Amino acid sequence: SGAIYVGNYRVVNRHLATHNDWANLVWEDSSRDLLVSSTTAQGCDTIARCDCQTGVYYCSSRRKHYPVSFSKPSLIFVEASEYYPARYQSHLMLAVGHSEPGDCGGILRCQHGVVGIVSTGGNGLVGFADVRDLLWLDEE
Numbered sequence: 001s002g003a004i005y006v007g008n009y010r011v012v013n014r015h016l017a018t019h020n021d022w023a024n025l026v027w028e029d030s031s032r033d034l035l036v037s038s039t040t041a042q043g044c045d046t047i048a049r050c051d052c053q054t055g056v057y058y059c060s061s062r063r064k065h066y067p068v069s070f071s072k073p074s075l076i077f078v079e080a081s082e083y084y085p086a087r088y089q090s091h092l093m094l095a096v097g098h099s100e101p102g103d104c105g106g107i108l109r110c111q112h113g114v115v116g117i118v119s120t121g122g123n124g125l126v127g128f129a130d131v132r133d134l135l136w137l138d139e140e
């Protein structure tokens with residue numbers, strides 16, 4: 001589990017969104033595994049606006065933050081899960097790192113801010129849904 005709280009927005013993995021999230025929807029994209037909802041209180045996270053390929057992510061299955069090198073956001077084939085069939089997921093970045101299904105939502109961050117959240121993984125790999133291209137997350 002995990003969310004990014006920037007301004008009046010809550011960014012969660014679309015497959016983990018609650019009834020309250022759907023009842024206060026701002027934007028969702030199934031192919032990116034992202035959903036954004038509105039919040040009443042202001043968030044303290046800051047979105048990275050950069051082209052970084054190194055950062056640090058939170059792994060709840062180890063209660064540790066790990067330094068990682070990750071690929072550029074792309075269209076990657078992802079195996080079937082309980083939440084999606086086997087399909088291509090867009091805006092996905094891969095890294096070598098420990099992950100388990102419940103690690104979804106952990107933040108990946110660089111020196112510029114929050115880069116994205118854990119979305120995919122398995123066999124010593126961890127994948128992150130990028131949020132750096134979503135410039136609207138900074139205003140209104």
Ligand SMILES: COC[C@H](C)NC(=O)c1nn(C)c2ccccc12
Nearest residue numbers: 033081083099100101119120121122
């Ligand atoms: C976009 O896919 C949504 C689903 C719920 N995600 C996964 O299956 C999944 N996510 N992580 C971090 C894993 C690690 C190990 C095995 C599976 C996974």
Ligand SMILES: [Zn+2]
Nearest residue numbers: 050052110112
């Ligand atoms: Zn950066």
